[PDB]
Amino acid sequence: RLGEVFVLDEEEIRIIQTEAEGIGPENVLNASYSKLKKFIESNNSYGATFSFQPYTSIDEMTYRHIFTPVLISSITPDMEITTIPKGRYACIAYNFSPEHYFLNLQKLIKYIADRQLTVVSDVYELIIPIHYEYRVEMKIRIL
Amino acid sequence: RLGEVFVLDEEEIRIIQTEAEGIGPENVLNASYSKLKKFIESNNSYGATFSFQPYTSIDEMTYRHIFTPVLISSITPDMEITTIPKGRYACIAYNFSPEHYFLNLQKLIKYIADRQLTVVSDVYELIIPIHYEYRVEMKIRIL
Ligand SMILES: [Mn+2]
C-alpha cells in the first residue's frame, strides 16, 4: 500500500494556504521540504499544489500554493482559508526521496491516462514529517 | 430578497480561476466589471475573490483570484481547476452600482460580526451580467 495508486474517498480538509511565488520541486529537491515550511510559518504537516500535467521533467514544474491543514481568526489576507473538498482521490504515498518523486508522479500520471480518468483539481502534495524522514501523499481529485 | 443577507446552503460549483495580479474593487469601480472578464477570457458569469476583513475603505481591498463557473481538459497551468465547496453561505445580492458595493459589503460584514459567525473561506464576488446591468452575489462560507 506504499508506492502505488489507489482511489479513496476523502472527507474534506480545511487548510490555510498562500501563493508559492515561483518555487518548485526542483528547489525542494535541492534542499529539504523544510523549504515550503518557511512559506507557511505564519498545523504540523504541510503541502504544495501544482497544475496536473504530463510533465516530462522536473523544471517544467512550479508550485502554485503552499498550504497547511487546520483544526482560526486573526488571519491576514495573503493567506487564504479554503479546503481540500471531500471527493474521490487518486492517491500515491511514499517515503520521500529525490529519485522517487518524479518516478511516482509518473505512475500517477500514467494511472490517470489509462483508466481514462477526469481530474478536477490540482495535484496536492502532502508532506508528513515522520519523527521516530518524510512521507509524501500525492493526490488529485477525480470525477 | 435583494439587498439583504440571507444564509443558504449551496451545492458545489466547479470553477476555473487565476491569480488577480494586484487588481481590486477600486479598479473595477473606475470602469466596469468587464475588467475581470479579461483575466479569464482563456462560462458566462465571472467573479473575484478577496480576503474577508472588516474593511474601512475600498483601496484597502485587492482581489486574490478571478474565476468562472464551468460545465474541460486542455487547460494550461496558470489556470486552476477547483470548486466553491458545497456549504452554508451568508449571501447578499444586489444590482451593481458603485455606491452599493461598499455599502453592501458593510452589511455582510456587520451581519457576521453580530450573529458572531465563523467564516471559512474568502468572500466570493459573483458577477452575473443581466442582458434584457450587473447582478452581484457576494457570499462567504460559514460554519
Ligand atoms: Mn492563488
From Swiss-Prot, chains A, B:
The keyword Chaperone does not apply. Activates transcription of the bmr gene in response to structurally dissimilar drugs. Binds rhodamine as an inducer. The keyword DNA-binding applies. This is Multidrug-efflux transporter 1 regulator. The chain holds residues 120 to 277 of 278 of the full protein. Binds DNA as a homodimer. GO terms for molecular function: DNA binding; DNA-binding transcription factor activity. Keywords: Activator, DNA-binding, Transcription, Transcription regulation.
